[PDB]
Amino acid sequence: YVDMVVNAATMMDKQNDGIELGRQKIGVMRLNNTFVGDRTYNLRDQKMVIP
């Protein structure tokens, strides 16, 4: 009984080891009060840009 139990358990353990459980997700977020992209202003003769 003891030997069967220990063997079966140790085989089950290495068999299930390929299961992948860590996963990535995508979150969408709208800005309400500002422009999302890097922002250009044109001065009289020149563009200048803010991150």
Next chain:
Amino acid sequence: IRVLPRFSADGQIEMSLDIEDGNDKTPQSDTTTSVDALPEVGRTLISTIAR
């Protein structure tokens, strides 16, 4: 006019604005007899953001 509009959830519109206006400099209109000149406006440049 050059413009870029944005909707804000408060029911407000935000615009990036470039405005240029005026009339062409004309030394050639040498005449005195036309004191009834077409009205001399200036020339003006503005760039800004407003909400």
